[PDB]
Nucleic acid binder design. Structure first.
Length: 96
DNA sequence: GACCGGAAGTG
DNA sequence: CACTTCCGGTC
């Protein structure tokens, strides 16, 4: 609850215990979803939204492209790359 | 079945 | 605004 998808993914990636569903892989920023159904299952669970799937989660990721929060790793399947430009901005404080 | 982005809905 | 839902492209 309250939590951004970009934050949720950093959360999982920060602990190598979650390697079986998501893990850093490649250049600075690059990660891949080893089990995207499980990643999406947890994201629905977190948001109380049990019809969540990879196809919906990924549309969320795709919206991050214009926001410069992340970008697709072309050719690698389930792999994306966080972009510091937009994360820095997203990390800044906001009213509540 | 990715992956894409348009379009419409949500609180 | 930051997603969720849905769906018709294209590979």
């Amino acid at each position: 609850g309250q939590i951004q998808l970009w934050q949720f993914l950093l959360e999982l990636l920060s602990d190598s215990a979650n390697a079986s569903c998501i893990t850093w892989e490649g250049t600075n920023g690059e990660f891949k979803m080893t089990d995207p159904d499980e990643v999406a299952r947890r994201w629905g669970e977190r948001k109380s939204k049990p019809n969540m799937n990879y196809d919906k989660l990924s549309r969320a990721l795709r919206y991050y492209y214009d926001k410069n929060i992340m970008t697709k790793v072309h050719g690698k399947r389930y792999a994306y790359k966080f972009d510091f430009h937009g994360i820095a901005q997203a990390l800044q404080p906001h009213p509540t």
